[PDB]
Amino acid sequence: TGRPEWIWLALGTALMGLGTLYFLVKGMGVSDPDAKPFYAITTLVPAIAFTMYLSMLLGYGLTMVPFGGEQNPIYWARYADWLFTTPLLLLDLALLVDADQGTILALVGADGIMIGTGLVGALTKVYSYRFVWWAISTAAMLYILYVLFFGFTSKAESMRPEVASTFKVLRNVTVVLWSAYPVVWLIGSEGAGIVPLNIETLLFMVLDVSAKVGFGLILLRSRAIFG
Numbered sequence: 546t547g548r549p550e551w552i553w554l555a556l557g558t559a560l561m562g563l564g565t566l567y568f569l570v571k572g573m574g575v576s577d578p579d580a581k582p583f584y585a586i587t588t589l590v591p592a593i594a595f596t597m598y599l600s601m602l603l604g605y606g607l608t609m610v611p612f613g614g615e616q617n618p619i620y621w622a623r624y625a626d627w628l629f630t631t632p633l634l635l636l637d638l639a640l641l642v643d644a645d646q647g648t649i650l651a652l653v654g655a656d657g658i659m660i661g662t663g664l665v666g667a668l669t670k671v672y673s674y675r676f677v678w679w680a681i682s683t684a685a686m687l688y689i690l691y692v693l694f695f696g697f698t699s700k701a702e703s704m705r706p707e708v709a710s711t712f713k714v715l716r717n718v719t720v721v722l723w724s725a726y727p728v729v730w731l732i733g734s735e736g737a738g739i740v741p742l743n744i745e746t747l748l749f750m751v752l753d754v755s756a757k758v759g760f761g762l763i764l765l766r767s768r769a770i771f772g
């Protein structure tokens with residue numbers, strides 16, 4: 546179809562694929578059992594992002610939704626990606642600060658709501674309602690971020706300065722990147738359609754890749770993954 550954004554899809558596929566292979570080889574060569582968890586989870590993020598990025602590049606994960614008097618292109622494959630990749634990244638942090646089971650449960654659930662109402666809004670035909678679902682999805686994200694900032698950061702204090710310092714970095718990267726998605730959605734094709742689809746795809750690959758490959762490298766290169 547030669548759509549104005551295939552350039553960004555092919556670059557995301559390439560970066561996600563590269564990060565996936567490096568983590569895979571870096572994780573399968575480690576003998577520390579207690580380290581496997583982090584490597585398997587971290588390699589699994591790029592992995593999923595790769596496949597979904599490849600599908601969109603090939604013309605899938607796309608559907609036209611009617612609203613605003615137009616037939617808007619909605620790349621739904623993104624949510625199929627985020628549904629499994631966000632809670633997995635949340636788990637990496639949870640296993641890092643000795644996060645309690647009840648906490649992990651609440652974070653995974655809130656995350657489920659976030660992507661759930663997120664896709665529903667992106668598929669809604671009543672323009673104004675799309676922003677209703679967007680509003681609920683965003684609130685769920687702020688909850689997760691609250692727990693990550695106030696809660697998780699407090700537990701990372703019972704760790705060594707090595708585990709507490711690696712978490713603050715991953716927490717900071719997660720807070721900055723996750724915070725930008727709702728805005729990108731709001732002013733993009735799923736929202737006010739102010740920023741064209743090609744730019745939007747560019748903004749997402751940068752965020753996706755930074756929050757996945759950029760997240761994995763920091764976590765896997767550190768020595769705080771050695772329980």
Ligand SMILES: *C/C=C(C)/C=C/C=C(C)/C=C/C1=C(C)CCCC1(C)C
Nearest residue numbers: 630663682683686723726727730756
């Ligand atoms: C690898 C992907 C990552 C780390 C994705 C993070 C995605 C978010 C924090 C997405 C948030 C959204 C909202 C707050 C509301 C509107 C719809 C979403 C799903 C784009």
